[PDB]
Structure formats: C-alpha cells, structure tokens
C-alpha cells in the first residue's frame, strides 16, 4: 500500500528557509511524478510544482519561479522541496502527492491526477514578537475592540466574570504585520459594563 | 497562474442532488479531458473524487459523478448525506506541463435551514478603524465588500475565516484600518443574498 509521510511542523522567522521531506514506500518511487501542493490556513489548494525522481527534472509554478527547490534522494526514496526567503504568507501546509506514471513518449507530468497525498507539514513563518494589546470600546448592542497583540490566545471577560447571557467574543484575525485583533460583544440601563481582558502579563478594564 | 473559478459555497439537503461548477479557459478546462476533483475535510489532505472529467477511482461511491460542457466542468453529487458536507477543489492540466486548481466550494449540508448574516458595523479614544462584525449565519459562507460613501475600497482590509458558534452556525468579522474617515457601509453577502450596514 502507497504511503507518504511527511517531516514534522516548521517554525521560522523571515528570510529564512525550510526543507520539508518526502518519504514514499509501496510503490516505486522512481516511477511517478511527485508534485508539491500547499494550502494557507482557510485558503485555498495551491500548486508549487513537479518533480522526476528518476531524472531529477523539475518545474515549478511561476509564482514560486527562483525561490523553490525541488530535489529528491532515490536511494532512500525521498523528496525534498525547500522554500526559501521566507514571508508571513508562505505560512502554510505543504503536501506532497504522487502524480502521473513517468513516460518517455507521453509528458505527464502536468495530469493533475493526484491518487495518494503526504500527511502534510505545517510551516509557520512570523516575524512578529510579544506584543501587549490595545483595548478600545464600541436591542441594544455593545462591546469593545482590542487591537494589535501577540501572541494567542487572549481571555476576555465582562464585569469580571458575571455576564454571560448573549456575550459574543469572535476569533482573533490575523493581519499582514503579524498581528492579531479581536472583538467580544454582548439600552434600556443604570449599568456599568467592563470587558475584563487577559493576555504580555496584560490585565486591563474597560467600558 | 489565475485559478479556476469555483462557487465560494453550496448548499443542499440530505437525498437531493448537487452541483458544484468549475470555470477555466479554452486553453485548459476546454482543451482536454484532464480535470480532476477533490474533497477535503477539515485537517486531512485532499481526496481524488473524480478524474479525467468523469471517471471514478474505485472505491469511491457512485453517487459522485462528473461532467463538463465548454470551459466548465461540473461535480455532481447525488443522495446528500452529512459526511458529505467538506470543501471541493477541481483541478486541471494547465498547458506547459503545469497544474492549477479551482479556488474552491464549500460543500454543507443543512441540518438547520439557512440563516441570517446579522451584522453589526461599528465606526470607532483613538480619534482609524472599521469594524464589521458578522455573526449567526449559515451556512458558514460570506464575502464582504466595504464602501467609502458609494465607492468601493479594497486596500487595508482583513477578514477572519469562518467560525463555528455552538447553535452550529458561524461567525466572522472584517476589519477595516484607516486614516478620510472624517459615510461608510459594510456590505456582507450570503448566499448570493447581500447585507448592508451603513455608517
């Protein structure tokens, strides 16, 4: 039976390179074009390129064009690609899947026939440090908006643990400087509101 | 490079029958028989469904068919059930010995009718920025769209995946960084159905 297995999760820092490995058994490894699929978390599949283990022969998505590496090891049946220079948005999970049969006479490596996929391997590319959060305020409806902190998760509370009834705190939403910011929610009063915040050893108030 | 267009979601109910379209070029999808589908739940690796437009691996189930007119290819799926319910990617020979995939469709199954999107916009010490908040709505599908009066702004704009709430729909928010601010609308869609909130 064809396995594909995967190296572990990555973390790095940008500018940086990661190799991530690709060990097939079951079948023969030189047979088979071995593409290379990645995925950024709630996005989309995204192609990066093939490779011949039997020649070496490569190609890569123009996208991806002097900045990936695809090389492989037949004596221990293992491909390799490795990114380099990496962004905040190379942040993704890396697939490796077996393609086509290898034909002289017949080009296949382009059949987008991918019958048996790597476990995957996470890499997870920030630049950003430990920074504490700002809190700001906004039937009636009411809440408070914190911006700019790092890392997760943060815990949120309303008049120090009483309210819960209708009390909405939405998932942090990353941003392209590495950031995070969420929001928690919950007329007629006569009250005082304050959301509770805890992170950064950062404990704030606020209505 | 430009993926294949795909519907950002569908939505059926368990026994009927659904589509899912996947759009490219003369110079791809209309070119060859070499379109490929597949399904992927959450935290595992994509699955083939459905290759060469229309044939079947074996050992998957005969109520995933495929078919393609023109430029478009198309994955049928007959006899909803709840494990269904996953994300679709069509995939095709892109000419050149290259590969593209579609951008993707959310496959749900309704276990509860369609709701909402309930939206609420703020306009907020730091006198920029703009808030959307979206939630109780599903299926867990929505794009936004945000406006400086009646003309739209695309820059400086970033938006949460969908979030699971725990009645089983979802919640999102979109967020807006500026300056200009000295009115301004939200605008969510939902099932091809667009909420507005004006500020």
């Known amino acids: 039976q064809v396995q594909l297995v995967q190296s572990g999760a990555e973390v790095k820092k940008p500018g940086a390179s990661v190799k991530v490995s690709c060990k097939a058994s079951?079948?023969?490894?030189?047979?088979?074009?071995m593409h290379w699929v990645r995925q950024a978390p709630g996005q989309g599949l995204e192609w990066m390129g093939w490779?011949?283990?039997?020649?070496?022969?490569?190609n890569y998505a123009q996208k991806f064009q002097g900045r990936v590496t695809m090389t492989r090891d037949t004596s221990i049946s293992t491909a390799y690609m490795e990114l380099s220079r990496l962004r905040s948005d190379d942040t993704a999970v890396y697939y490796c899947?077996?393609?086509?049969?290898?034909?002289?006479?017949?080009?296949?490596?382009?059949?987008?026939?991918?019958?048996?996929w790597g476990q995957g391997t996470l890499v997870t590319v920030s630049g950003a440090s430990t920074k504490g959060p700002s809190v700001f305020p906004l039937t009636a409806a009411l809440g408070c908006l914190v911006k700019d902190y790092f890392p997760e998760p943060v815990t949120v509370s309303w008049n120090s643990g009483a309210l819960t009834s209708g009390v909405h705190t939405f998932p942090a939403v990353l941003q392209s400087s590495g950031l995070y910011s969420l929001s928690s929610v919950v007329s007629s009063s006569t009250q005082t509101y304050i959301c509770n915040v805890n992170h950064s050893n950062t404990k704030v108030d606020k209505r | 490079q430009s993926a294949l267009t795909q519907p950002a979601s569908v939505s059926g109910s368990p026994g009927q029958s659904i589509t899912i379209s996947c759009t490219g070029t003369?110079?791809?999808?209309?070119?060859?028989?070499?379109v490929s589908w597949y399904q992927q739940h959450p935290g595992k690796a994509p699955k083939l469904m459905i290759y060469?437009?229309?044939k079947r691996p074996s050992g998957v189930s005969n109520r995933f068919s495929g078919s393609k007119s023109g430029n478009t290819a198309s994955l049928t799926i007959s006899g909803l059930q709840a494990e269904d319910e996953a994300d679709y990617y069509c995939?095709?020979?892109?000419?050149?010995?290259?590969?593209?995939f579609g951008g993707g469709t959310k496959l749900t199954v309704l276990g509860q009718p369609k709701g909402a999107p309930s939206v609420t916009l703020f306009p907020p010490e730091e006198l920029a920025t703009l808030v959307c908040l979206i939630s109780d709505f599903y299926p867990g599908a929505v794009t936004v769209a945000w406006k400086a009066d009646s003309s739209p702004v695309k820059a400086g704009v970033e938006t949460t995946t969908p979030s699971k709430q725990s009645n089983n729909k979802y919640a999102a928010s979109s967020y807006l960084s500026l300056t200009q601010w000295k009115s301004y609308s939200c605008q969510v869609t939902h099932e091809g159905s667009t909420v507005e909130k004006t500020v």
């Open positions: 899947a077996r393609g086509g049969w290898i034909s002289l006479y017949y080009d296949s490596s382009g059949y987008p026939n991918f019958d048996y």
């Open positions: 079951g079948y023969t490894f030189t047979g088979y074009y």
């Open positions: 490779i011949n283990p039997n020649s070496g022969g490569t």
């Open positions: 003369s110079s791809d999808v209309g070119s060859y028989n070499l």
């Open positions: 060469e437009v229309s």
């Open positions: 995939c095709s020979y892109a000419g050149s010995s290259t590969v593209i």
